[PDB]
Design a protein around this motif. Sequence first.
Motif, mmCIF file in Angstrom:
data_model
loop_
_atom_site.group_PDB
_atom_site.id
_atom_site.type_symbol
_atom_site.label_atom_id
_atom_site.label_comp_id
_atom_site.label_asym_id
_atom_site.label_seq_id
_atom_site.Cartn_x
_atom_site.Cartn_y
_atom_site.Cartn_z
ATOM 1 N N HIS A 291 -28.440 -39.217 11.773
ATOM 2 C CA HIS A 291 -27.463 -39.212 12.585
ATOM 3 C C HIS A 291 -27.803 -38.840 13.964
ATOM 4 O O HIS A 291 -27.962 -39.102 15.435
ATOM 5 C CB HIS A 291 -26.009 -39.334 11.806
ATOM 6 C CG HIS A 291 -26.253 -40.351 11.406
ATOM 7 N ND1 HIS A 291 -25.588 -40.883 10.822
ATOM 8 C CD2 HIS A 291 -27.260 -41.286 10.572
ATOM 9 C CE1 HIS A 291 -25.404 -42.511 9.476
ATOM 10 N NE2 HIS A 291 -26.269 -42.491 9.914
ATOM 11 N N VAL A 292 -27.086 -37.534 13.874
ATOM 12 C CA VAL A 292 -27.459 -36.626 14.879
ATOM 13 C C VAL A 292 -28.211 -36.440 15.366
ATOM 14 O O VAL A 292 -27.905 -36.891 17.299
ATOM 15 C CB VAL A 292 -26.703 -35.158 14.417
ATOM 16 C CG1 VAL A 292 -27.121 -33.883 15.536
ATOM 17 C CG2 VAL A 292 -24.999 -34.908 14.158
ATOM 18 N N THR B 298 -28.827 -43.197 19.880
ATOM 19 C CA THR B 298 -27.789 -44.380 19.567
ATOM 20 C C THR B 298 -28.357 -45.963 18.727
ATOM 21 O O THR B 298 -27.480 -46.150 17.576
ATOM 22 C CB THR B 298 -27.117 -44.473 20.497
ATOM 23 O OG1 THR B 298 -27.251 -43.223 22.238
ATOM 24 C CG2 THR B 298 -25.518 -45.163 20.762
ATOM 25 N N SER C 9 -28.791 -44.729 15.574
ATOM 26 C CA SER C 9 -27.116 -44.061 14.464
ATOM 27 C C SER C 9 -26.843 -45.334 14.554
ATOM 28 O O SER C 9 -26.383 -45.743 12.963
ATOM 29 C CB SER C 9 -26.937 -43.180 15.060
ATOM 30 O OG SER C 9 -27.345 -41.926 15.331
ATOM 31 N N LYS D 202 -20.290 -36.783 16.751
ATOM 32 C CA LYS D 202 -21.559 -37.470 15.865
ATOM 33 C C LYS D 202 -21.758 -37.346 14.139
ATOM 34 O O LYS D 202 -21.482 -37.567 13.527
ATOM 35 C CB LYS D 202 -22.828 -37.495 16.120
ATOM 36 C CG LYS D 202 -23.435 -38.430 17.487
ATOM 37 C CD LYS D 202 -24.822 -38.381 17.859
ATOM 38 C CE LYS D 202 -24.788 -39.121 17.305
ATOM 39 N NZ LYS D 202 -24.586 -40.837 17.917
ATOM 40 N N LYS D 203 -21.492 -35.712 14.264
ATOM 41 C CA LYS D 203 -20.910 -35.051 13.114
ATOM 42 C C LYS D 203 -19.570 -35.292 12.482
ATOM 43 O O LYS D 203 -19.640 -35.999 10.973
ATOM 44 C CB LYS D 203 -21.210 -33.645 12.647
ATOM 45 C CG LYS D 203 -22.588 -32.954 13.496
ATOM 46 C CD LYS D 203 -22.423 -31.664 13.375
ATOM 47 C CE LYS D 203 -23.061 -31.448 11.904
ATOM 48 N NZ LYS D 203 -24.428 -31.801 11.674
ATOM 49 N N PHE E 47 -20.131 -44.704 17.150
ATOM 50 C CA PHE E 47 -21.142 -44.065 16.998
ATOM 51 C C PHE E 47 -21.437 -44.292 18.853
ATOM 52 O O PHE E 47 -22.157 -44.209 19.384
ATOM 53 C CB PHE E 47 -22.402 -44.886 16.406
ATOM 54 C CG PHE E 47 -22.843 -43.716 15.372
ATOM 55 C CD1 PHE E 47 -22.215 -42.316 15.516
ATOM 56 C CD2 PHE E 47 -22.542 -44.357 14.178
ATOM 57 C CE1 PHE E 47 -22.511 -41.311 14.477
ATOM 58 C CE2 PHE E 47 -22.446 -42.808 12.381
ATOM 59 C CZ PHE E 47 -23.199 -42.054 12.948
ATOM 60 N N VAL F 125 -19.551 -43.048 21.299
ATOM 61 C CA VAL F 125 -20.333 -41.343 20.688
ATOM 62 C C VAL F 125 -21.191 -41.694 22.025
ATOM 63 O O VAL F 125 -21.122 -40.775 23.115
ATOM 64 C CB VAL F 125 -20.008 -41.022 19.817
ATOM 65 C CG1 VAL F 125 -20.894 -39.247 20.069
ATOM 66 C CG2 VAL F 125 -19.041 -40.440 19.377
ATOM 67 N N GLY F 126 -22.073 -42.661 21.669
ATOM 68 C CA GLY F 126 -23.730 -41.951 22.908
ATOM 69 C C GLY F 126 -22.742 -42.752 24.142
ATOM 70 O O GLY F 126 -23.715 -41.847 24.996
ATOM 71 N N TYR G 14 -21.886 -39.486 25.632
ATOM 72 C CA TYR G 14 -22.676 -37.968 25.888
ATOM 73 C C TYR G 14 -23.667 -38.378 26.727
ATOM 74 O O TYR G 14 -23.833 -37.678 28.002
ATOM 75 C CB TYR G 14 -24.000 -38.344 24.577
ATOM 76 C CG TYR G 14 -24.936 -37.049 24.478
ATOM 77 C CD1 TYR G 14 -24.804 -35.770 24.187
ATOM 78 C CD2 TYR G 14 -26.416 -37.734 24.899
ATOM 79 C CE1 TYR G 14 -25.561 -34.940 24.175
ATOM 80 C CE2 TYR G 14 -27.012 -36.375 24.353
ATOM 81 C CZ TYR G 14 -26.953 -35.690 24.931
ATOM 82 O OH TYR G 14 -27.595 -34.286 25.211
ATOM 83 N N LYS H 192 -21.643 -33.711 23.225
ATOM 84 C CA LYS H 192 -21.294 -33.744 21.924
ATOM 85 C C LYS H 192 -19.733 -32.892 21.745
ATOM 86 O O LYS H 192 -19.385 -33.119 20.339
ATOM 87 C CB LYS H 192 -21.501 -34.412 20.946
ATOM 88 C CG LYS H 192 -22.808 -35.138 21.630
ATOM 89 C CD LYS H 192 -24.350 -35.709 20.797
ATOM 90 C CE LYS H 192 -25.678 -36.385 21.275
ATOM 91 N NZ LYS H 192 -26.383 -36.904 20.017
#
Lengths: 111, 52, 155, 536, 47, 438, 58
Positions: free
Chosen positions: F209-210, F214, F217, F273-274, F317, F320-321, F324, F330
């Motif tokens: 995933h990391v 995007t 993920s 992401k983690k 996700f 988060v994308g 980023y 991140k």
Amino acid sequence: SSRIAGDTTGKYTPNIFSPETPMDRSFSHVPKNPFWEAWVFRRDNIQREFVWTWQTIFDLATFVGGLYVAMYATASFCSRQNDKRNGYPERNYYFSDSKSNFVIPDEREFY
Amino acid sequence: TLLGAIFCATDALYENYSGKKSYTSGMVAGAATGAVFAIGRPLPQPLVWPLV
Amino acid sequence: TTATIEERRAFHKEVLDIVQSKLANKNSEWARPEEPILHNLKSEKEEPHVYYHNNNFRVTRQLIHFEKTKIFEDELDKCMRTHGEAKYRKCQEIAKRFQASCRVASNLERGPNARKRDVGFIYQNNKLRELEKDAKELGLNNPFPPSSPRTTIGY
Amino acid sequence: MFLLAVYFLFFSAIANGFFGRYLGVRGSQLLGPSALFLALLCSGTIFYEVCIQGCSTNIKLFENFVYSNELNVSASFLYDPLAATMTLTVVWISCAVHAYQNLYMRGDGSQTLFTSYLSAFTGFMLILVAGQNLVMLFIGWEGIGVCSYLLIGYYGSRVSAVKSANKSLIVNKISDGFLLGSMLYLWFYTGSFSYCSLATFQIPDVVSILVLLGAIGKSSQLFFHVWLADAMEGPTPVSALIHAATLVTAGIYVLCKLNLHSQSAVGILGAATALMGGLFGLAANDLKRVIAFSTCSQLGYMMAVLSTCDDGADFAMGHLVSHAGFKATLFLSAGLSIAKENNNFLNRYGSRQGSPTLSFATTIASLNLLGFPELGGFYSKESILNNAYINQGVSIILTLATFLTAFYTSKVLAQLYLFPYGNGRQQKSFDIDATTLICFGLLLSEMLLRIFTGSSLSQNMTTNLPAHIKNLPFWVALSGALSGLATTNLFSSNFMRFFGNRGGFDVFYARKCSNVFYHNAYVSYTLLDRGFLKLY
Amino acid sequence: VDSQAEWYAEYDKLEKARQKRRIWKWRDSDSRDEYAINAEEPVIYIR
Amino acid sequence: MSLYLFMLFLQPLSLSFVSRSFSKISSLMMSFATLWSAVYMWFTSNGANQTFYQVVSWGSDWSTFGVCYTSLYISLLCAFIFPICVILVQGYRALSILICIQTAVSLSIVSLHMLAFYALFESSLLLFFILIGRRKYGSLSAAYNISIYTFISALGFLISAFWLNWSFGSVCALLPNEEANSFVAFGIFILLWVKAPLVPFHLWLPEAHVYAPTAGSVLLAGVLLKISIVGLHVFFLPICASSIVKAFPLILSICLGSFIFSSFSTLKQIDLKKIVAYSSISHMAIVFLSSATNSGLGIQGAVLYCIAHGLISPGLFLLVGILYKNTNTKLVFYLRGLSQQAPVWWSVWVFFMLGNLAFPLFPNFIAEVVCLSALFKNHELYAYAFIFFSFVGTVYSSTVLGRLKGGVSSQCVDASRLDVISWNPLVLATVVTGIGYM
Amino acid sequence: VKTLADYIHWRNKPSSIPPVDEYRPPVPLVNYDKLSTQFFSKLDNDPVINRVLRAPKV
Ligand SMILES: CCCCCCCCCCCCCCCCCC(=O)OC[C@H](COP(=O)([O-])OCC(O)COP(=O)([O-])OC[C@@H](COC(=O)CCCCCCCCCCCCCCCCC)OC(=O)CCCCCCCCCCCCCCCCC)OC(=O)CCCCCCCCCCCCCCCCC
Ligand SMILES: CCCCCCCCCCCCCCCCCC(=O)O[C@@H](COC(=O)CCCCCCCCCCCCCCC)COP(=O)(O)OCC[N+](C)(C)C
Ligand SMILES: CCCCCCCCCCCCCCCCCC(=O)O[C@@H](COC(=O)CCCCCCCCCCCCCCC)COP(=O)(O)OCC[N+](C)(C)C
Ligand SMILES: CCCCCCCCCCCCCCCCCCCC(=O)O[C@H](COC(=O)CCCCCCCCCCCCCC)COP(=O)(O)OCCN
Ligand SMILES: CCCCCCCCCCCCCCCCCCCC(=O)O[C@H](COC(=O)CCCCCCCCCCCCCC)COP(=O)(O)OCCN
Ligand SMILES: CCCCCCCCCCCCCCCCCCCC(=O)O[C@H](COC(=O)CCCCCCCCCCCCCC)COP(=O)(O)OCCN
Ligand SMILES: CCCCCCCCCCCCCCCCCCCC(=O)O[C@H](COC(=O)CCCCCCCCCCCCCC)COP(=O)(O)OCCN
Ligand SMILES: CCCCCCCCCCCCCCCCCCCC(=O)O[C@H](COC(=O)CCCCCCCCCCCCCC)COP(=O)(O)OCCN
């Protein structure tokens, strides 16, 4: 020293040769830190500093194995109680040594 | 030969004493062989070899 | 009870005949059967047609049970709201019936590992009655409470 | 008509927090108070219809909110006497707080978002109080929990406020988890989530313990009171709402709605929380902290009374409704004092020319807290103390808590008004608009009406006690008040220090529980997934 | 759209395929040397 | 059903004939057409057919496809979430890889043959090795992890499928077969153990995933984890129920241990992401345990919770994308002041994080309630264990939000028009499911 | 006897050694910070404290 890259009208062009820096998506990037970057690297690559010591073995066994044992014992107790509650014969579980073949209750049968 | 003798002896002795053919007999024979293998080895090996 | 291979193949042929009779006329409610296919098979999986039909009957029945339970709950709630402070005496019966419906719905298809749903504490009360009877007759001292007249609004 | 109040609050929330760009600061200063006034009219109608005229109503919004197999719950609202009384009190206090926020939050950038959060907070409280099933109560319980998280941490650039909000969230998670477990036990063995069918004469101890553990979170009892003191980081309007009604009361409401509590536990836990909260409030030097510890003590009294008698539930709810008014008044007045003086410490307050209305409202709220005879607080507190005589242990502790309460309350009143001026010679001022005066008029009106209308049906019923035993609460209160005015020393420096550290519950959590939590996380991650099981 | 007919047709097709597979899985040795197991087979050897 | 399968086969086909400049537009239109075909499949699925709504066969047991309750929900989720992945990805190579992965995954869900299921799900093995191991933003370690874990688990599943095909003579789900063998049960189980991350076989997921894009993920968390529940309901519980009941104390131990250790591991994470990946691992445990109880309440609860996760994890996700892209970081430590600097991103982030914590107005609440009820039906302690440890999720989420919420920041990093467009469907779907239209 | 055990790279020593010099975050200074481990102490009733706090007329 800066210019607006985006054009709402749609006539957007990248002035790659402009003396003035475009205010593109890169304008808002956060400045990194040499020490923070090394901390991030150390945190991710923490397997390098792993060492097998008695304290490490003790801690691992006591918390991970200890929790797994407690969880198995609780689940076994709950299964035993449910079998007694339901009235089913002692079920043949995998590690249980039972001289009974009962596993799935018969839906037709009345227990 | 010594390691195989240890394994076979312990397996037979446990099976006779217990009186039943079981997984435990093999586990205890393996553990004893791995203990003999790792007599003077550094720290991780005493745990790893009896397990393997 | 033993089932000979001759009887098993005979039942299989009869099942095929039942399927053929069902196939002759189109039915929009084919998978909502009102009656099960009666059998004496050791495993229902042996006859696939019986297995699927009976499973569809069981699903139909369970859906009906769930809706019946909802109806029972609605009458209990109306009864409770009408009586006022006399609810405990007058709504004992409706509550008893609702709790019985809940047990029937949950217990019929609880699953292989699920415990019986003791709505109303009937099983616990029964167990305590048996324990009391045994302790009293054998002269033992019971460490458990005696059975209760009423443990819930109904049961 | 019954739905209207919830509609008005949720509308005010959506309008201020989604359409604030159009409405403006002034638009929120209109729509908020207007909606709350309309909700007050609806709540008054509900109170008259249900409480006074005994007409409970059930409004089912929709069916099959959750429909998985046997499990079936519906969104329904039952307005029973407890619901009507709490709805009325909550809406009255919220309307006052909304009027108060117009002037207090003018100096804050997001006044639209603040008003939105206050109205959503009030709406979720009304959902919790009026729910007919346990799921609706859980929806309200979580909604108030989230609104508190969003309101305590309103100042994001302060690490203390964000930590206070995290603390609240975690404590409330532990409590609602115990509640979820108890609701699952009750659904499984009774067949429904509705309170009508929920009734069980004999319940296994486990369900009682789970219910109590769930309730002690919102109603900050011992071991779970850490978040209340910290919740002082938030703006003053938030503190008034949470402490007076929305949060502390929910636990008591849950215990009274479903009488699954055990007499032995509730009495001891309550009396302990009353004494500890009073002792903690004695040491406190922040005005807002002392009123929080006072809230803890009063909650202890309400929890303790449930053990004494059958009418304990009625007595507890009566104290809860009486307490919400005066306690709200104390917080709003404290906020105005802080705003006018730019100071939070009791040492630097003193006599200074001010508004007559604010000083009177503070005096009357303090008197209600103290227990001055012929006041709403007095009747609701004597009903508890007199009926607790049968339980010798609970009574002695509660009388000692009454003494400590009187001592700190009198000390605070002396320090804020009687004492000479203690702040510096600098220009400070906060001018009060007519909206603030309306807010204090509303609080005083609630306080006056409470005396005439009462708090419980059994409030004035005779407790067959000797005269000396019936009038002792008064003597203990007077003695404490006199000792507090003299500002005498009661405990040695070792104990004063102990009480200032609040018993060291948080020091225990940090040194042992937090260290164990992060060692478990270290073993789980560093030693195992990213150590033993990670390739070179 | 007669769902009952479609279901029975699909089940029948799967059952026929399973039967054909099991018939196919019955395979004796085809070795030229192994005359005993294949005595009835009609083969001519040019050797 | 036939329309859905045809559209599925047309989407990879369309790319071969596009102009190479119209690729993104054509791919988006094809994704929307596949969504509409899925809606048509839902319309043509009558509840009267209780067992299987629709079954189609194209000449062989392998080409037997059908939709059930689990299959219908997962297929609709995949079709709903694919357009978002499509718009987030740029380049013909990336589009080709993504469209092939999606076609393989969507064909796997509706497959009713174990061997065909294996053929379709594991076809997208090299494509993930190449995607996670891309030149600049990818990690070879993560690619190797995911690929090796998938190959070993799927090979075990394949061996079990071969034995079932030899012994019974067919491996199609529609033919009722029962097996008491423990080796075969373990073979089928190991795939489920790895695919739905369960401790200690969860290490492949966070790395993938990391270092995935995007779109990758979003697809992975949204639907790839769900493929385990389709295998359980369709290919494990019908045949290997006896072994799940025999091993229930062990299953419960492993699922609860996964939930606890994953929650504790999430506490030590510094990468957004983690954090989202470990939250998914923790959430998968309840679904797995609930289905293993083999009760109506459990199967429905597991599918519902899966849909809720497949609506909440893609949202996190995606946010988060977006963050980023705006900041190129991140690390939670570098990201501060996001409340003041991005009020619109922050609002959606807070909403999705509240959803992840299973609050009442979110689908997660209803799903969790049903799953907990199923566990309570089995044993009260089973439910209590899961309910109590849920606080750990709160601690990590609260700490993250608090670190992000305030501080000093000199960069305005807020979402553009494109970013709001991408999350609006997810927000609306979350709200609708939250209000009870599950 | 040569064995795999001799050539396996056992994790007995850390491959990477953390830097000795480590960052300590800036903190507001507390002049006197000795912890009080004794609930009952002579310090509380010290003659100095009595003269400074208890005795002065207020
Ligand atoms: C009748 C009226 C007419 C109506 C039309 C109806 C006709 C029906 C079908 C006709 C359509 C044309 C078929 C296309 C043939 C060429 C396709 C191709 O070359 O792919 C890349 C090509 C893109 O070309 P390019 O961008 O210009 O650059 C490529 C350069 O040549 C070299 O570039 P590079 O060196 O940089 O390589 C980089 C490489 C990165 O490196 C890798 O990743 C290598 C990985 C190895 C293969 C990937 C393993 C996983 C593939 C799974 C299969 C995908 C479908 C998943 C569904 C599950 C099926 C069980 O990345 C890629 O190449 C694309 C990544 C994904 C594409 C992989 C899928 C292709 C599989 C085999 C292609 C067929 C070749 C047959 C050769 C015939 C004579 C030579 O085509 C595409 O647009 C994407 C692939 C379309 C897949 C449809 C082909 C069917 C294969 C599915 C197998 C099912 C059995 C076949 C039955 C089909 C229906 C009967
Ligand atoms: C960027 C956003 C800016 C815009 C903001 C939008 C503002 C949204 C407004 C919030 C909506 C609040 C309304 C909540 C009720 C949901 C409405 C609803 O679901 O419709 C119901 C009809 O019910 C209603 O209309 C409810 C009345 C709504 C208004 C009544 C009072 C308003 C006060 C709000 C309190 C509601 C508490 C409910 C808590 C669960 C459908 O009827 P059924 O046919 O039975 O559907 C089946 C049920 N199920 C969904 C589970 C499948
Ligand atoms: C139940 C029936 C009716 C339901 C109505 C619920 C009430 C309104 C719900 C509106 C949407 C719910 C969630 C909104 C998104 C979540 C984000 C949020 O609420 O606030 C955002 C931003 O807020 C918004 O823009 C939207 C809020 C509009 C209305 C919010 C009302 C309160 C939310 C209700 C809680 C949701 C319940 C979920 C669990 C029950 C972040 O705020 P802060 O983190 O505090 O930072 C702001 C900056 N400052 C530091 C200065 C404070
Ligand atoms: C090298 C790897 C391992 C090395 C280190 C391992 C050290 C761990 C050893 C102790 C771990 C916890 C103790 C559990 C097992 C105790 C002994 C097992 C035998 C046993 O089943 O006794 C039962 C224990 O009680 C029970 O049923 C369980 C009670 C304890 C569970 C709760 C304790 C912590 C709770 C935390 C949550 C974990 C569980 C969540 C569900 C009660 O006997 P019986 O009546 O059942 O008769 C059954 C016939 N023996
Ligand atoms: C791939 C399997 C390899 C095992 C992996 C375990 C982890 C490796 C660590 C090395 C430890 C040595 C191997 C021990 C595993 C056996 C389990 C111990 C349980 C046990 O002691 O009971 C025995 C039976 O279990 C048994 O002996 C049969 C249990 C079968 C082993 C577990 C099968 C599934 C494990 C796979 C998990 C994940 C796969 C990845 C490796 C006794 O039985 P008894 O009859 O003697 O009764 C006694 C009458 N005297
Ligand atoms: C009215 C209802 C009751 C409300 C609260 C009652 C709490 C009563 C429990 C405290 C009384 C018994 C304490 C145990 C005897 C210890 C005597 C000296 C303590 C000692 O030497 O070590 C301490 C251990 O911490 C400890 O003593 C922790 C033990 C506490 C047990 C857990 C009970 C919950 C406590 C919650 C509030 C208590 C706050 C203060 C304890 C400090 O250890 P260190 O950090 O200096 O070690 C160095 C780090 N290597
Ligand atoms: C009768 C038989 C008796 C038993 C005998 C057993 C003997 C050995 C059995 C082991 C079989 C397992 C196969 C996996 C081997 C581990 C992976 C190789 C390690 C490795 O370095 O791979 C690198 C990356 O791999 C990775 O990043 C992957 C990380 C580790 C993969 C985890 C394995 C999957 C899960 C394991 C079990 C799961 C369930 C078991 C039923 C690529 O190296 P390179 O390309 O640079 O090559 C350059 C040369 N050094
Ligand atoms: C130590 C804890 C166990 C770890 C597993 C935890 C949870 C896994 C449960 C999965 C659920 C279904 C799987 C069925 C059984 C798997 C493990 C059950 C426990 C077990 O090992 O029981 C053994 C029997 O199982 C067997 O004989 C088969 C064991 C599995 C084989 C290992 C690798 C097989 C891979 C084959 C690939 C496909 C092959 C298809 C032909 C011995 O128990 P016992 O009854 O003898 O009791 C004697 C003790 N006194």
